[PDB]
Amino acid sequence: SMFTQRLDAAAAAVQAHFDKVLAAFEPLPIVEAMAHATSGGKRLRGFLVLETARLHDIAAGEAIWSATAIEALHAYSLVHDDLPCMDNDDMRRGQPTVHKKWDDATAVLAGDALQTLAFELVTHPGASASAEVRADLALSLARASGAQGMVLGQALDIAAETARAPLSLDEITRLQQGKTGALIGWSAQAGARLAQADTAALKRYAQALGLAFQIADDILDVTGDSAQVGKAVGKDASAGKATFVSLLGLDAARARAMSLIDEACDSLATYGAKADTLRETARFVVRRTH
Amino acid sequence: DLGTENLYFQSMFTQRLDAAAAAVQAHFDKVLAAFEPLPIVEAMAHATSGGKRLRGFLVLETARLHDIAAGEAIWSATAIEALHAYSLVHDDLPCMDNDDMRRGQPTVHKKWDDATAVLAGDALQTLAFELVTHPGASASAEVRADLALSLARASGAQGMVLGQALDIAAETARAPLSLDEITRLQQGKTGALIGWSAQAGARLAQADTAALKRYAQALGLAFQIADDILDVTGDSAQVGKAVGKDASAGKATFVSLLGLDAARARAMSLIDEACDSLATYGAKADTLRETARFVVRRTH
Numbered sequence: 346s347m348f349t350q351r352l353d354a355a356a357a358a359v360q361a362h363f364d365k366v367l368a369a370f371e372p373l374p375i376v377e378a379m380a381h382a383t384s385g386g387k388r389l390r391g392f393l394v395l396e397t398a399r400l401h402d403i404a405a406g407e408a409i410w411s412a413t414a415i416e417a418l419h420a421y422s423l424v425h426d427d428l429p430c431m432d433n434d435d436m437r438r439g440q441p442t443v444h445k446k447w448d449d450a451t452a453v454l455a456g457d458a459l460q461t462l463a464f465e466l467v468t469h470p471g472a473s474a475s476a477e478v479r480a481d482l483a484l485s486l487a488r489a490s491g492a493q494g495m496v497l498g499q500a501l502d503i504a505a506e507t508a509r510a511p512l513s514l515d516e517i518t519r520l521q522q523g524k525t526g527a528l529i530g531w532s533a534q535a536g537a538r539l540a541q542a543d544t545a546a547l548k549r550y551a552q553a554l555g556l557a558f559q560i561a562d563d564i565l566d567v568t569g570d571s572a573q574v575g576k577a578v579g580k581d582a583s584a585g586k587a588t589f590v591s592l593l594g595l596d597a598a599r600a601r602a603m604s605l606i607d608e609a610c611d612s613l614a615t616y617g618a619k620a621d622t623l624r625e626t627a628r629f630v631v632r633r634t635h
Numbered sequence: 636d637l638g639t640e641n642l643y644f645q646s647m648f649t650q651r652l653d654a655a656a657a658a659v660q661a662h663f664d665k666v667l668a669a670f671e672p673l674p675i676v677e678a679m680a681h682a683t684s685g686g687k688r689l690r691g692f693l694v695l696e697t698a699r700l701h702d703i704a705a706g707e708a709i710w711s712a713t714a715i716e717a718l719h720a721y722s723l724v725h726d727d728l729p730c731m732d733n734d735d736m737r738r739g740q741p742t743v744h745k746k747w748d749d750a751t752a753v754l755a756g757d758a759l760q761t762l763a764f765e766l767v768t769h770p771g772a773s774a775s776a777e778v779r780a781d782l783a784l785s786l787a788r789a790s791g792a793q794g795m796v797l798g799q800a801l802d803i804a805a806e807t808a809r810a811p812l813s814l815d816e817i818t819r820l821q822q823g824k825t826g827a828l829i830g831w832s833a834q835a836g837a838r839l840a841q842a843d844t845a846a847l848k849r850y851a852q853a854l855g856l857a858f859q860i861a862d863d864i865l866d867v868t869g870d871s872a873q874v875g876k877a878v879g880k881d882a883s884a885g886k887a888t889f890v891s892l893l894g895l896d897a898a899r900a901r902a903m904s905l906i907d908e909a910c911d912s913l914a915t916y917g918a919k920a921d922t923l924r925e926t927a928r929f930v931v932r933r934t935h
């Protein structure tokens with residue numbers, strides 16, 4: 346009840362911050378596309394930033410910059426992933442994708458500008474009184490987002506598409522760690538970085554959470570309803586992809602995801618009960634219907 | 636032959652530009668060596684190799700002007716070259732300007748495919764922010780954060796990508812733009828990154844940026860006029876990319892509006908304005924004065 350309330354409030358706060366910042370830009374189609382691509386979503390990543398910041402006694406009014414930043418980065422990655430030359434999706438978050446509503450060029454550019462906006466948001470002085478902190482947030486964001494992190498993941502996903510054999514569990518795990526793990530890792534570590542505090546516990550938490558999240562996303566592709574998930578389902582099989590469900594089967598995938606909840610929760614022990622919202626987030630990542 | 640010898644650029648300028656191009660390429664090599672050998676990474680290297688390095692050079696020479704070590708400045712120089720490279724990879728795509736050749740080589744989407752181009756361009760943008768925020772870029776975290784903030788404002792939907800979006804709107808309409816409209820578009824599309832490059836040395840030194848900002852406003856416009864002139868009169872073998880593109884795409888440019896002779900003249904007036912903006916630096920800015928002559932007189 347308290348978890349659900351916090352999540353709803355975080356989503357509202359992130360949306361309000363996007364509405365502020367994007368209303369400062371010129372009212373051109375590319376900016377309208379930026380606003381379209383950043384609306385909606387569960388706000389898992391932003392919520393992680395806000396709740397890890399709360400854990401470390403960082404002001405919400407500062408943490409919102411970093412929470413909006415990671416949502417802008419994540420949104421960019423989806424705008425490009427949905428492109429015809431990529432995964433070619435017509436719908437995202439229950440709405441047409443940017444290239445559908447506008448066109449491919451607008452999607453390329455809107456995505457590009459959203460990546461840039463992520464960096465503007467974390468380096469804005471509001472993000473932290475400490476320039477050490479802002480520089481560190483930006484550096485770690487770039488390393489999480491680029492060709493050692495999320496884009497590496499995207500590249501491995503492409504390699505797989507036409508791999509001679511199907512990937513092993515170890516290969517799809519390394520793929521997951523770039524493709525989804527990196528940005529979730531940045532989000533969870535954010536609060537510790539904001540406080541210049543040790544990131545080890547939250548890094549461990551996120552390693553487990555990110556894997557559970559991906560297993561859940563693979564399960565939604567197989568058993569979910571496009572009306573509730575807001576995107577096409579059955580995609581993975583159509584593309585012949587190894588996924589956690591193809592390798593493990595559904596029962597064992599679900600069970601592995603549940604065991605990862607325990608690992609994520611155990612990682613937080615040093616924080617005590619102040620980390621309970623992060624514990625419930627781990628349960629959410631597996632339970633969720635979308 | 637680019638006909639460079641025939642132009643008699645100053646010795647120090649020539650030596651410094653050559654050294655800067657070699658230093659930037661070396662830094663790309665070093666940084667990219669840490670990444671995995673996948674097509675996207677090979678495409679990142681491809682897209683970053685070559686070029687005149689005008690923007691990286693500006694960073695290195697404005698840092699020199701403010702007594703900032705080259706070993707620090709190289710980070711920011713490489714950063715801007717990574718950002719610029721990204722912008723070209725995306726611009727060259729089939730859905731954008733649809734170019735097969737850049738810097739005398741096949742473009743990324745030609746040598747690999749569109750997805751690889753999209754992603755390599757994406758990772759190069761990211762790499763630009765990695766490079767400027769790396770602790771090697773400055774001992775001051777305030778400097779690094781401000782370099783990254785200013786780079787984001789130069790690059791995003793108030794700067795370079797704004798410029799791109801305006802350009803697309805113009806091409807689609809085959810729009811007759813005014814001199815003021817072509818100027819505003821230029822300020823985003825090309826001025827913003829040149830401005831960041833020239834202000835970089837002052838920013839690295841926590842010094843006043845006003846002179847170098849004014850220098851770059853003039854330099855950037857002179858550069859763009861020169862680029863427009865190359866489209867009309869240049870040789871694809873020297874320029875390394877297709878020419879004649881602008882008329883076919885129904886793009887108003889400084890040349891289509893003013894004509895060649897008046898565009899050239901305007902570019903010459905801008906050399907003088909750029910040189911004038913450096914008067915408060917005295918002779919130490921001589922390399923930056925010759926750079927203004929290079930931007931107009933280059934053959935590529």
Ligand SMILES: C=C(C)CCOP(=O)(O)OP(=O)(O)O
Nearest residue numbers: 386387388389438524525562
């Ligand atoms: C990384 C992946 C699997 C893309 C979708 O992420 P989410 O399921 O968190 O998407 P939104 O809530 O942002 O729509």
Ligand SMILES: C=C(C)CCOP(=O)(O)OP(=O)(O)O
Nearest residue numbers: 422423426432495499524562
């Ligand atoms: C970095 C990105 C965009 C990860 C996308 O993974 P998916 O392709 O599984 O995400 P969905 O499209 O299924 O949301």
Ligand SMILES: C=C(C)CCOP(=O)(O)OP(=O)(O)O
Nearest residue numbers: 685686687688689738825862
């Ligand atoms: C902004 C423009 C006109 C794109 C090409 O820039 P340059 O002519 O500086 O290209 P390279 O030297 O980097 O190839």
Ligand SMILES: C=C(C)CCOP(=O)(O)OP(=O)(O)O
Nearest residue numbers: 722723726732795799824825
């Ligand atoms: C921001 C960018 C990519 C500037 C492109 O301008 P041009 O389209 O004139 O550059 P060229 O392709 O002619 O080099």
Ligand SMILES: [Ca+2]
Nearest residue numbers: 426427432434
């Ligand atoms: Ca996808």
Ligand SMILES: [Ca+2]
Nearest residue numbers: 431432502503
């Ligand atoms: Ca994919």
Ligand SMILES: [Ca+2]
Nearest residue numbers: 562563566581
């Ligand atoms: Ca999926």
Ligand SMILES: [Ca+2]
Nearest residue numbers: 726727732734
């Ligand atoms: Ca072009």
Ligand SMILES: [Ca+2]
Nearest residue numbers: 732802803806
């Ligand atoms: Ca164009």
Ligand SMILES: [Ca+2]
Nearest residue numbers: 862863866881
């Ligand atoms: Ca041109």
